[model samples]
Target chain A: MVFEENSDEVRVITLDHPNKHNPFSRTLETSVKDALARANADDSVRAVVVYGGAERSFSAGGDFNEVKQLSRSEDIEEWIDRVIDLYQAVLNVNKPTIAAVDGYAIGMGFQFALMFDQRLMASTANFVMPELKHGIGCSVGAAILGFTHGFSTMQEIIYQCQSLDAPRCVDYRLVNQVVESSALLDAAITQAHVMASYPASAFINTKRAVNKPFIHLLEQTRDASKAVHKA
Target chain B: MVFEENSDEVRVITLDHPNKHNPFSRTLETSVKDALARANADDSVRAVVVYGGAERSFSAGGDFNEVKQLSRSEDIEEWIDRVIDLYQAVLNVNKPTIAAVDGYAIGMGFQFALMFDQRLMASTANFVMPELKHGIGCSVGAAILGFTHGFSTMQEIIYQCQSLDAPRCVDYRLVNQVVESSALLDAAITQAHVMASYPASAFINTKRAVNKPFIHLLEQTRDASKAVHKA
Candidate 1:
């Protein structure tokens, strides 16, 4: 992950695994956690934008090759814990967070984007939560999307495993805004700066209140999932 | 209130206060609770549809005049408990419930619509959560809308107090479908029949799982609100 903080006080963290399409492998997840930690600590950073460089990918989601190799329940639980930790880290950031989307945001990537305060997607970007097709349980995705879209809509999304383009995403109110591919990052940064103008304490408090219920729900779901796996 | 059980096994409860536009006064609220109780106990009733009649209103929400007269904390707490009981009754029915919405679905009415398993709106329907403008706390609205549409979107809807037309409601995924005003009830009944076709045990179990988190969140919010009011 490459971190850049320009004059706008917006920290842009680019996930840059070009050949592999920025798979959220273990290393990338750790780098992102560290970057977010630094952003939270530094007052100079007013907002953070996460993107997947020029490779036309936000993230291809988890590295399935790594997923396939996990045969033991202990290892599987460890992996789930890591994923949950990454999500918690993202949501815990005190400042505004935005996702600049250009291409694929699938599986865990889709859930990751949903955790952001806002999302600005390139017109070419597509989102999918195809965990069901892969024989993966969908409790996490369901909790994320169902809570935001109501369970009826959430059922169609997770069960159908359909790919939604930017327009459809906007219709679903999933993405805050959609722009041309060339303007994705600039648009995200511009919005980030707008949010950065708010008084820090008021903004932070409001963010916390807004995020509190979601945080509670996610914790409840992940905790239950972990307990089930452990048993 | 008018209760009609048609040949389709769909029970239609019409809020028939034409002049007041169905304000959901205490009497109306109790009537609805009783109707829902009957529907739940009668296995012959496969689904329930609630709507306001030809007067063009799903509900104008709480009778603010009554709200203006509530001077005692004891009375206010009792009122809130009554409202909570009505919502719980709507949600607790074992079979599918649908809202056939046509005119104003404002404040408590808007919250009421969100409780249903699904909503089918008329082209003329409009939704608003203008509680903030009236100096009302929005925790319940936020929990209902925020849980389904991320909190960012929820903030705009509640804070702005702007009216959202049927199409915009569709864009927000707040309403499942919108039909012409003439066909609103028919559409709702048709959908209810479709849902009734599902095997009872499977559909009811899935609905319970889907609604459990929301039930938990709503109960927590109302309980907290009651505590603050009582204290």
Candidate 2:
């Protein structure tokens, strides 16, 4: 987990576990929370861009091998709590965060990308949430999926677990823009610069105003998901 | 009903039933169909804007009170068929339509606003759909609302049955723009003019391409709604 500041307006955070497709591990999750907290506290940083390292892929999702290893231990509940906390922390961040997506963003990776206010995708990027196919129900993915897209589109995407390229994701409104693989980072940075040019106070207030209804819906949905998970 | 031509590029079709808030009646429905058909066939008319007569409302909806008064004697099925036909005609028109909403656009009035590709509202305009509150268990409003705003928002808007003002409507992406009451027509016409400036074939093809997914989803949802109604 490496956080690099670009100029003074944008912070680029990379998931360093490239060998494992940078799957969401405990350490990576904590790093994300810390990075977001730091960015939110810094008056100079206006936007955050989260991306995958160039080694292998964005992320395949949760580390299934790690999950299996954790299942062998007696403290699996603690691990689940940590994962939920990480998601909550990211959701509560005030500044605009963008997912600079490339290669694959699947399962938990896809959920995290959807958490961002905007998504910018590389032309080569493919997205899917295939937890159902692996015999586990995806509660978080289901909640966010229904919020971002219509019920029918969400049903289609999750039930099919179909991997979609950039154009298809744009058509679905899952991604706002798509650029060539080599230009993805540059494009995201350019967009961040454009956003940063706006008056900081006005931008933050406008975002909060526009997102108020959605945030309310998310909170209610999150509570419901927790109840379902517990049940 | 009055149909007025503006600068050979835009047409305004006014609902003249001021007594009942320009509620959809057989005559008004027929006039709307005739006007839209003529606009679609006229090469000089590139776009159409629909509005209600001054001092009255855009519309209160289908003449529910009128239907109730003639329930025993009227052929209710024919009335429904005509309403559906009018909606389909609006959707099938080749030229883009913009709904210039002022006053109240409720129930079917709200649905008709959604039928158009774009909507411009007066600051005083109020949008509401109260079908769920009544015993009426179905609405074609879902077809348009679900496509643009997603199911959850649609459900909340319909179930809550609150009249949403222009600013709130714009925030929800229900209305494209909100202008002063005096400028509502001008604003809608300006949008229509911009749309008309595009090449005819390119405009049609682009609209079709963008609407392909939405049309596909509409068909499935419409079928499901029909089945539910039948059940």
Candidate 3:
């Protein structure tokens, strides 16, 4: 996971595990959190963009192999806790974040992409959330899907584990914009640069104010989960 | 205020202060809040619709005469607090609320209409928020309006104090739909009945879950204000 600082005001963080289709491993998750924190703290960096490395996936979500291995481990609760923490950290970061998605953004990968302030998808990109197909009940991250699309649309996607290509994704408003496969990164970078040009404090404060309601609810839910665990 | 129960599910709560064009007087506010609370508690009630009794006006916002008198009294804090609480109570109610509006829904009236989950208007309806026009800052009600429309839209509405006709309201997504003046109540009641068909718990929980994030943010801002007062 290499976090690159371009000359522009946007910080570019790449998920380097291309061999795994850029799955969201614990290390990559930590790297993303750190990158967002860095961008927020830096006055020069006004926005942050998370993208896939090389020509591979933006993400395939939780590493299946890692999940399989962890399922047999005694510390599964800790692993799940860390994953939730990293996801929240990305969501709560004050700076604007954009997902530059290409290839496959599936399951947790799709969830992460949906969490960003904006999303840019390549024409060839495929997005899916296969949790329901895999016999796993939808998680909190999956619940956020309804916020982006209508219930009927969400149900269609989840119930069928349907893979959405670029056009369908745009129709669903899952992706803010889409471009030719070759110009995906450029399109994403242009959006990032444009967002980065806004006044940092004003942008962050307004974003905080707009998102405060949702974040507060999530925090309360998390706190209750902690209390239940303690009991 | 004549609070009329149309059916098992829908109640028409009217602003009756015709002398002031129902300008959000303390009595009207209290009555409206009580109507909303009762709607929430009653198992048979599925939705509440708010409208104006006077044919000439929906509401003109806070009564200017009352404001002038209150300005001379040092003990107006309680009134202000009550107004704030009334706004919050409308927003916090679990069941679906609708504003069937016509004539003027101005200032606090504009703000209150936006607080409802859905709004419908007669072709003769006019909506405006004139806080900027009057050189007075808005309060929690403004925050509710901001959530209904994006920040830029909110700024535009307030900055110009433009009186929005029914068509403009539909275009802005402020009103879910607009009907002929003759069919206004019928249209609103039909919509309310459709919403009321769902199981109470499921309907309320779904609404709560969808709004959870935004309302949580509003609570945070309110809590911060309380903390400042304590400090």
Best by lDDT: 1
Candidate number with the higher TM-score (1 or 2): 1
lDDT of 2 by residue, B32-94 (tens): 888888888887788888888666688888865664444432264455556667766777777
lDDT of 3 by residue, A1-231 (tens): 855756477788888874648877777887787877777788777678888865789888875555555443334556556655766777687776878898999887887776677788888889988875765545444445654444566677888888889888876657767887788777777777765655454355445554555456455545443333333
Per residue, candidate 3 scores C-alpha lDDT tens digits across B54-135 of 4647788886446545542233556555656776777777877888887888877887776677888888889987653444
For residues A100-180, write the lDDT of model 2, one tens digit per residue: 888899888887777676678888889988877765556667777877676678888888878888778877768767888
- After superposing candidate 1 on the true structure, give the runs of residues whose Cα lies further than 4 Å from its correct spot: A2-31, A34-48, A54-56, A61-79, A93-97, A106-108, A126-177, A186-231, B1-57, B60-82, B89-100, B115-120, B129-139, B142-163, B168-220, B224-231
Q: Per-residue CA lDDT of candidate 1, range B112-216, in tens?
A: 988899999988889998765555555667767877666657965764567999888987789899999898989999989999888999999898888888788
lDDT of each: 0.80, 0.71, 0.69
Steric clash pairs (candidate 2): none
lDDT of 2 at A15: 74
Between candidates 1 and 2, the one scoring higher on lDDT is 1
Q: CA shift at B181, candidate 2, in angstroms?
A: 20
Q: Which consecutive 10 residues in model 2 chain A have the weakest lDDT in total?
A: A202-211
Scoring only the second chain, what is candidate 1's TM-score? Answer: 0.94
